[PDB]
Amino acid sequence: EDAELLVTVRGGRLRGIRLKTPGGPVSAFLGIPFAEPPMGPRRFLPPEPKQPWSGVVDATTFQSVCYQYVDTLYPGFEGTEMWNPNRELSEDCLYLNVWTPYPRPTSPTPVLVWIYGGGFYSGASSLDVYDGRFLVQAERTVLVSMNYRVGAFGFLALPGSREAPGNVGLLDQRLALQWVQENVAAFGGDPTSVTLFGESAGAASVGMHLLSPPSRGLFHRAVLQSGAPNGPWATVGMGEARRRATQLAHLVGCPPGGTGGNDTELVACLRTRPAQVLVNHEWHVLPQESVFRFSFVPVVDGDFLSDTPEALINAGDFHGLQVLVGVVKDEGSYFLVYGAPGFSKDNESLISRAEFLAGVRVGVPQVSDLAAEAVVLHYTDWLHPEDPARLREALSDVVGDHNVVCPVAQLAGRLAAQGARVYAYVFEHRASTLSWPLWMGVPHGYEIEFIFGIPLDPSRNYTAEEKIFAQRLMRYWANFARTGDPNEPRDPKAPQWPPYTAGAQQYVSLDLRPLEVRRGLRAQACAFWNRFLPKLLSAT
Amino acid sequence: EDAELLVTVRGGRLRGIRLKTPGGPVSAFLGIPFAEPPMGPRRFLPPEPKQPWSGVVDATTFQSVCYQYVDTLYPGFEGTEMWNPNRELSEDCLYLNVWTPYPRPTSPTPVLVWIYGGGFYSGASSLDVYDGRFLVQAERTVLVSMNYRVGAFGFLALPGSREAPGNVGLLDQRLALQWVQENVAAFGGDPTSVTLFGESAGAASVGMHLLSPPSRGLFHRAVLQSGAPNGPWATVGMGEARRRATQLAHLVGCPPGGTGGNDTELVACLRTRPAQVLVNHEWHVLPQESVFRFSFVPVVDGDFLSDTPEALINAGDFHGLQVLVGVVKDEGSYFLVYGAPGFSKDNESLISRAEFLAGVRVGVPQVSDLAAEAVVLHYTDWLHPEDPARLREALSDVVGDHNVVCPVAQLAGRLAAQGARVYAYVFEHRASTLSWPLWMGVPHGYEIEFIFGIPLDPSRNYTAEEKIFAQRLMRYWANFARTGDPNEPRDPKAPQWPPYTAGAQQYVSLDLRPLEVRRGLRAQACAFWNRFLPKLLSAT
């Protein structure tokens, strides 16, 4: 009843809201504070737990979005603005949301925790495509999603100093995980069956938590969608993070005039600046000749990450852990319209040979000219080295393999070979309502709406097949959250999803057709990135 | 009583609104349609007059802003967003506004007509800084302002063809001028005493009307604020206009693969595209290595402009015309934060010598290496060739002189020497409420709020001296509109404003201090741009 919309947690009382789905109602608790507002002197600091409150906190609507850059490449366009903030920006943003079935579960229920992506510079738990009402109604699981500080506010780092240690955006997620341990039982959720799942930078975050011992105790399973902590964009060195942080200070006038520039005076100067001012110079801090490179990302400090993600994945024991990994068919196409020459969402992006050669330097930055030739002469079809359509898909493969598919395949192989049960997929269905052009195929990010069951929304023009497809995927994700195995615990009639192993390298394709097993997550291309290219880079 | 808010014009009846000023009320008629909506098959075509309507058109609020790019360089910033659209974007935007004193004048009154700036790619008559309620109350004049199509919708040109003839944005302004001839009498205005005044691209527009015979009959005096038709940014050649238009068609997928590319099929394809799609690719049409260069500007076709503005100004007889021209102290500083390396509004923009040498390439983009050297070695202080503060102001002088001050001084000299009475000014007061940084001084466009008397708004924190100053400036502009002479028609107490002649080159400084006469509008620098540099291009 209306009594199930009232819940007490360790910090105080909450009033939720009843959400409707075509299959029945759901109880949602949107906007639960899990940390003290990280403002004024607490900007750039690790989060402090929210102190208990008197009265009833209203938990009926999403709270503020953390301060972030707002994408303006295509104003008024659905394909880009669906990721933009849909609540007002504020540094007061450390809130989490909880969906729970109606009636509330009597017995402890497995908990899904969502970590949004957005390159560590954007994103929000309030986005329409992260609506948890459909996954909770159809699979009677408990869904939690948190906000975490992005951009400079979450990942500006002057390593060594205590005024700006870095990775505070990861600590925000960790605190939200500690909050789930201490309070998800009150919503009917099992704190012993917690399944993290994220996408892009959210998936990378999930991977960073697997490799951080303090976070490792707060969950039991992991799902990484189109991202990995070992990606070339997901981390940064201490020296580069200090250079970026210092350059941002310079751009906003820090330190003032002629004055000392130790870490303490620099952060104090940064704390006096309005939040929007720091955001307005976020992209100017990089060399600014890049697609896929982000200014403030997790730093390898020796604290949250004792070593690089690659090192920790190799030297890591993963027995007793189940992972679900995967990518979309066309991982790189969405990013090409963000700086690759000759590309535009409003034409066919039939690029020339010279544009392809320049795009490789944009999509694979920082590498040497000989390394670029290895990429070009490996992704060229030499029977059609000038076909524009093939060059377009080649560059899309170049930036997709280098940034997503091969970092993911590298990780999935090391996990399976080191004792973790791993299941791998490739998402190959292009939504019928997709607004991006046809040549992008199944772009990065556009499986999320099917995992969250958005096709079930009656106010959307999804086909009957996509509705059944969405229910199928929700069953896969929920079964993995419940049992660690996406396969039906009692249904062998439907095609089976074999584990992924370093040898067989099996995965399944997710589309309207029944499950189909394949071998190799682009094994040929990924051997070039994972094996040959590092040996080639030790020429300088 | 309230019967003065109802007025009949040639097309039908209108209901206006009474606006309040601290000195008394004013009658405003906001949103008068003067053309048929240029939508669908009419896009890119010259405007057609608004056909008469039945009933009473509501004229109590500003109408839609013409489709245009929206500046996002500093989100949430007062200094940039005061120029952004403050009404909904639409192609249905050919509307004009009329302010008139209360009580309505019984004898014919001089008419001021405002043409907004915005580089021919943006701007709107509805901006708060253009509100004529204070100018009309204080000086009992009649103020008119129109919207004209900007960007591709106003200035896309495939010269020779009739599907996209070009300069249709200038024809929108002309139609609004024909409208003032036929209807301003109904508001108490004298159609024989019409003074055009504009700023930046608006000032350039005013100048192109002086040089177009069909427009010359529609007004009697001109005011040009920080702009001129002979500026290097204000016009474009036929060949370049065709190349730019074709590039925009390619970016939006026109024509579809395999279709012929004649002008008819190209424009037909462009007309099917949504307006926002064309706007989203406007800047991608240039080489895109330019501060101060705009994609779609008036073309020199032989129709609206029988020759280049430079030729028409030289070969022109300007007897019987009074012109008021001028500039602000720091014309170029506004534009450096829009692409000049090392510049940011949030620090002191202390640029290096290398950044200065690179910025000259951005501020003067069309030149050769040798021409750039002549610029660098002319604007360098050779006793302090590395002082960043001086280099900063040197680049501001480079950009300001090349784009505004010297094209204006060129025009003002030719006009006075060829029979026009000319008055020249330099605006030297930096508003106390200015939000741009101090190092920008008096940036481009920040005299407008004083000409329009915005300091009189009680909801603003302007000083008492700026209020008196704004009233003084309104008297100058109004006196010029009535008599052709900014000086008080019978008051020799105040210092007097001498005409500007090709020899004495006298102008006045407008600031809180009384008028002060000076000689030379950057005469030394402008000899370099107007006389010497054309001679080094001649070494092709």
Ligand SMILES: NC(=O)c1cc[n+](CCCn2ccnc2/C=N/O)cc1
């Ligand atoms: N203000 C700027 O100049 C700016 C440049 C690049 N970006 C890139 C962000 C968009 N993006 C979306 C997905 N991946 C990216 C990264 N491209 O580099 C944003 C802003």
Ligand SMILES: NC(=O)c1cc[n+](CCCn2ccnc2/C=N/O)cc1
């Ligand atoms: N989308 C873009 O990357 C973009 C580039 C340049 N501009 C030019 C800004 C307009 N402007 C304002 C004052 N001066 C200028 C002209 N700059 O060339 C706008 C947008």
